[model samples]
Target: KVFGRCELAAAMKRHGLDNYRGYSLGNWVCAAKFESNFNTQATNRNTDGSTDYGILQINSRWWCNDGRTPGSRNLCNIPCSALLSSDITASVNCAKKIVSDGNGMNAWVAWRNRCKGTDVQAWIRGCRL
Candidate 1:
């Protein structure tokens, strides 16, 4: 399911993205905005043969296993397909794992470039969080 801007923000809030690992809700909102545009079924293939999946675009190289990315770490221990669903609970949980893995929110390049040190809260401005 593709989410409206405020809808996504509220969803994230419900999933506890706020202040997760010291990153606020806006940080994740900004990352998801650029990563998948709130599209739950979004997927992107990298030049290195690994693919990113779902709204957060978790990568096969280090996160989930898609059965096609050879030698993936599968740190999330979940099927990559799980991240593509509209529920987003799995995505939120896996993202928590990502942040707990010593990576913090910097694991996302888009976030680093556009989210950090900026008022990314605007991404969730209309949401009643």
Candidate 2:
């Protein structure tokens, strides 16, 4: 949806993800930057033949229903399209579930590969959130 980085940070903070699931705000912001660049309409095809959805690039195989995908666990009980909107409530709620599943921020490959230990404070560098 072309939202800015600081805006995303503020929204995430408002949703309590500044430290939700024991992850720092920088972790979430950094992951989202690498995953979808704050584009709510982002989607990608995974190597496993499943699709990823929205800003978090949530996998359809386990997290959400995308209709065409069969056998989705739908752990978040939300439609994949719902996460693709400017309103990030569904995406954040689903992300919370993913985190609570014992994955922490590691559930996102971007977080593990890119933002895991780097100086991620730059992601929210000037945000007032």
Please write out the lDDT profile of model 2 over residues 1-129, one tens digit for every residue: 967999999999999898886788999999999999899999999877779988899999999988877776889998888999999999999999999898688999999999998988889998887
In model 2, what is the error at residue 106, expressed in angstroms? Answer: 0.8
Instruction: Write one digit per residue (lDDT tens) for candidate 1, span 1-129.
Output: 999888988899999999988888988989999899999999999988999998999999998998888877899899999999999999999999998888698898878887889998788786888
TM-score of every candidate: 0.96, 0.96
Task: Score each candidate by Cα lDDT.
Answer: 0.90, 0.90
Where is model 1 more than 4 Å wrong at Cα?
A: none
Ten-residue segment with the worst summed lDDT in candidate 2?
65-74
